[PDB]
Design a protein around this ligand. Sequence first.
Ligand SMILES: CCCCCCCCCCCCO[C@@H]1O[C@H](CO)[C@@H](O[C@H]2O[C@H](CO)[C@@H](O)[C@H](O)[C@H]2O)[C@H](O)[C@H]1O
Ligand SMILES: CCCCCCCCCCCCO[C@@H]1O[C@H](CO)[C@@H](O[C@H]2O[C@H](CO)[C@@H](O)[C@H](O)[C@H]2O)[C@H](O)[C@H]1O
Ligand SMILES: CCCCCCCCCCCCO[C@@H]1O[C@H](CO)[C@@H](O[C@H]2O[C@H](CO)[C@@H](O)[C@H](O)[C@H]2O)[C@H](O)[C@H]1O
Ligand SMILES: CCCCCCCCCCCCO[C@@H]1O[C@H](CO)[C@@H](O[C@H]2O[C@H](CO)[C@@H](O)[C@H](O)[C@H]2O)[C@H](O)[C@H]1O
Lengths: 570, 570
Amino acid sequence: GLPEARKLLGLAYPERRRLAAAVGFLTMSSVISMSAPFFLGKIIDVIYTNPTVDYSDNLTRLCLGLSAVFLCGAAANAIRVYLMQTSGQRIVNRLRTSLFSSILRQEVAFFDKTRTGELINRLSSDTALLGRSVTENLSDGLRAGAQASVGISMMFFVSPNLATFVLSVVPPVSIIAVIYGRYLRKLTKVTQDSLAQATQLAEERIGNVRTVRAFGKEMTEIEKYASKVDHVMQLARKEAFARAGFFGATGLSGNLIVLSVLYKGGLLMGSAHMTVGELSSFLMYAFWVGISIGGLSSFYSELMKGLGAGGRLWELLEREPKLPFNEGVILNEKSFQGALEFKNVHFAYPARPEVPIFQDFSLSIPSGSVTALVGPSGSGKSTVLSLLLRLYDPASGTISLDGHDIRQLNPVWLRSKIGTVSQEPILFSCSIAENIAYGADDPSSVTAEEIQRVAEVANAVAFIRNFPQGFNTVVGEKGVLLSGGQKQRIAIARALLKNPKILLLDEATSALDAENEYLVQEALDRLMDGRTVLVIAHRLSTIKNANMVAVLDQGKITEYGKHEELLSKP
Amino acid sequence: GLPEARKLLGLAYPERRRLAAAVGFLTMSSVISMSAPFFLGKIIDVIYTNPTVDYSDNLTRLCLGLSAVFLCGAAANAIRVYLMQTSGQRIVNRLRTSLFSSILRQEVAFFDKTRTGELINRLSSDTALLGRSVTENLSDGLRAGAQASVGISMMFFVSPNLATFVLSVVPPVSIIAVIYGRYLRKLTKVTQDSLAQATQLAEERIGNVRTVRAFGKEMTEIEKYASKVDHVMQLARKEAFARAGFFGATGLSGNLIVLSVLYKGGLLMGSAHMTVGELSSFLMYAFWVGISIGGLSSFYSELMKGLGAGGRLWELLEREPKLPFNEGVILNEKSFQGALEFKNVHFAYPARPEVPIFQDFSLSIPSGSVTALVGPSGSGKSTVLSLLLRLYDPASGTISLDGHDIRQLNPVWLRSKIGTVSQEPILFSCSIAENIAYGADDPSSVTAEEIQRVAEVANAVAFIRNFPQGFNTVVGEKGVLLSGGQKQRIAIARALLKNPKILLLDEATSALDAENEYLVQEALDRLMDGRTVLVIAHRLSTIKNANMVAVLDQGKITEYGKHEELLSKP
Ligand SMILES: CCCCCCCCCCCCO[C@@H]1O[C@H](CO)[C@@H](O[C@H]2O[C@H](CO)[C@@H](O)[C@H](O)[C@H]2O)[C@H](O)[C@H]1O
Ligand SMILES: CCCCCCCCCCCCO[C@@H]1O[C@H](CO)[C@@H](O[C@H]2O[C@H](CO)[C@@H](O)[C@H](O)[C@H]2O)[C@H](O)[C@H]1O
Ligand SMILES: CCCCCCCCCCCCO[C@@H]1O[C@H](CO)[C@@H](O[C@H]2O[C@H](CO)[C@@H](O)[C@H](O)[C@H]2O)[C@H](O)[C@H]1O
Ligand SMILES: CCCCCCCCCCCCO[C@@H]1O[C@H](CO)[C@@H](O[C@H]2O[C@H](CO)[C@@H](O)[C@H](O)[C@H]2O)[C@H](O)[C@H]1O
């Protein structure tokens, strides 16, 4: 309501001087324009009164004068439109940057409960709506509002009898038409509800054609759908009958209302209360009020749509992340060794809080050691990485870095010290070089020599240069699809460029081939060297060579020790 | 072109009598309507010539007569709209059923290369377009075409000088405006291309916020996006300048063209070549031609859109499935025993033809035996089920049922004999009872007693009745979410109701809990009894108890025999 309009006020505020200039051009053009029916009525009565008089010179002067008025009106409109559009574009730009900045500051839990599609609809559609609502739509309502105001005033000035008549007739007709319109909307909802059901059934059955086939139900589904769409046709016929009636009734009413004005006006002329010019003026103003009422109606719908968008954008713009974005301490070179400690950690994902991942999880990972995490569910093991990068906070317990609770540190800084290599790595739809550069604190500051060096160590340089575009080859989803081994080696190149003291590896037991597996293992060994390594082990070789082995069973470290001492225990 | 219009012809053909009646009402209304500027010009000249004459009785008779004309016109419009809408609805209904029927007849390979979203856009949007293109849009172009035709003819009848003048002036202005319009479209594309890039970047980075966080790149992405949207603003300002110029130029040109007609017309009146009424008639017809040109323009855009839709729908309607839908033999009771044979089967999925799944795969599954399929990739093992249900055909080799190549049999029938229980079952968004009933050849013919019986055997009846709605509980995605064990037991209830001689089980090694695992194993044992079972084994108990064990290595049966004889072999 009142604080909503206050937010729309401040939104247009940085552009107040452009919008004021444009409103000034809009007022000038709209009010000068409103004078034409009045002056046309005077000319109509002049021709009527004097049919024997030569009007060539007046006409030539008037048409030369009107040319000049039209050139001015065109210049004023050009300026007004440019000022309005550019004002909106600046507002939408400020909405895009502000909205994107807030979204990326939110905790992972927020993304867990919010769909990417909805956030993109807010960044696309809602920013467009909100931007034009305080500009184009505000100008549109302002013109229509002034033109109904001037029009109605001019109808009463031209003839207080005919204006009072129109004002007594239109409202009852408009009220009845609104009630008929609301009925027609309900018959439309009934049809579109039924059509939505049929389309959802169709979508489900196409999407699960393998299950449909498997049970020999293609013919059944075809007949089911045919029954649903035959019922839609039944509803659509009822709707069509009500729509035909409405268009007939509103059309007749519109025509008869105009006819009544021509008839009452015709009689007022005969009785000398009015001239033909005066009636012409009245009808032009009445028609202009009609259009202006339409304009105010369209302005109200777009204002409500823009306020709807406004509520959705102020929701994210004002959202305070439930986890700090760039806040906390940084450790010095002397104190940062890369030792990690889990102490009585309890955790369940925000989306599935009913499923406990950790239940009193304690694990001590000393500096420069290789600790192999072993256990049943990989969901539990993979969650360790998420908590170490503080994507989430434990429900209970603490995670410490060199004795410091990771909550007391700058999360951006914490993450710069912890590198990761996934079973299935994520590469953005940009060049290989940009993807590798991403590892650096400053990816625009990396040299081609640094990118090439880590690409050699990661055993990635040969397949990259074997691309026609080389390091300029656009990868990701929207680009060139890479093999699992190729994606992993670029992930290792990125890790090497990051150069973290702590490394978290998730071993890929799902897929690896004779050619890739060798060059990936060789690169992973070079990467693992001189770093605190936490590895979700699947390969027997990494478990035997690891300094320690941790058994994760039902979200707790049940057994911990060297691989050999673990075989002789149970 | 010519065969395209021939298809649109036949589309409207079943509704030819409704559409003819509506066109008749459209022609009547449009041609009677076109007479009003002519008759208004005569009345204008009558008032002008006789200002001293009482016209009250003529006006009252004319307004009573026009009331009757308006009541007729309203009735004709109501009928015309109803006939047009209902004709389109019948056409769209025939397009929905025909299109859905063709889609579900297509082989699984088709769905492998076609997105569900695209098929739903063809069933939603394109059926709507095509249906209104031969109805509403055809009527719209027909009215506008007749009204430009009558209008232009009437402009020449009213004044061949002024009509020739307008015809010499509008085309040069229209050509120049088209060239300026095409330029403005290119500046718009440049802006919207840039905006699409920025939005895609935003979508990717929001969608991969975990990777962005992990490398401390939230601030980098925010600044990257801000750079892209600042560049969009630069393009949008250039576009805004060209749009402002175009609206200024087209506005001025429009106004000056009308002014030229008022001036030339004004001079023709002075020289006695025309009357005020005649000029009024001419301007009304000129304005009506203007609107009609707009109407023909809108009709051409919608005709092209509808032809675009038409090409996409005739593509699927005329597509011949690359695998038979409901064609082939059925075996008798005596000859159907449920014995299966794979002979030198070679296969690679249509989407990934570079990856061979089977390379000379041969496996003999005798009637009433339990064969356990064991091996590395589960992708290979799961493909056996797809080939047995003939969702695909082998590239080489044969699959036989009781000595008959499954290609020679009716695939619907073949599938009625082969049941399946997946690790992750598929349940539609309908009642539990409807989901269970799906197993039957006639799911509407199953009794509540039959559904309850299989639900008891499947150990499903207790959790189903423990639902507030019971067997009426809507499950699937759009409904009540069930546990893995609950979904599996309903899958077993459906299998029991199907009562197949052959059963294909995919053992769920991913998830199973102490409570579910017992009741699911008990139900699976009752289901496995007296049937030819092929089980993708993960549980050691099922491999030891199985009649035979088949080792699948690199898409071939490397070792086959009893579990004990297999341990002493390598
Ligand atoms: C859905 C559509 C609904 C439309 C409703 C139609 C309503 C009918 C319209 C009737 C119009 C004619 O209305 C008629 O106007 C004249 C002229 O002002 C009035 O006539 C009276 O007042 C005028 C002055 O105003 C005097 O000159 C005249 O001598 C006197 O008789 C009539 O009292 C009135 O009945
Ligand atoms: C569908 C219906 C379409 C018809 C629309 C309504 C037409 C009404 C019928 C004709 C009534 C004629 O009414 C007549 O008009 C003229 C012109 O204004 C009036 O004339 C008055 O104004 C004109 C200026 O236009 C002066 O030149 C004249 O000295 C003055 O008396 C007459 O005093 C009046 O009697
Ligand atoms: C972007 C907008 C472009 C708009 C272009 C504007 C073009 C200029 C319009 C000029 C209109 C006036 O055009 C003028 O009309 C009169 C009246 O017919 C013509 O006049 C001539 O023919 C008429 C008959 O038709 C005779 O009665 C008259 O005595 C004779 O001089 C002039 O030869 C012509 O020049
Ligand atoms: C922005 C410009 C707006 C103005 C639009 C154009 C107006 C032109 C200027 C006035 C010219 C007046 O021209 C004058 O019109 C009248 C009315 O048709 C003509 O009169 C003719 O028709 C009328 C019927 O309407 C008859 O009653 C009359 O007997 C007959 O001669 C005159 O012979 C002509 O000289």
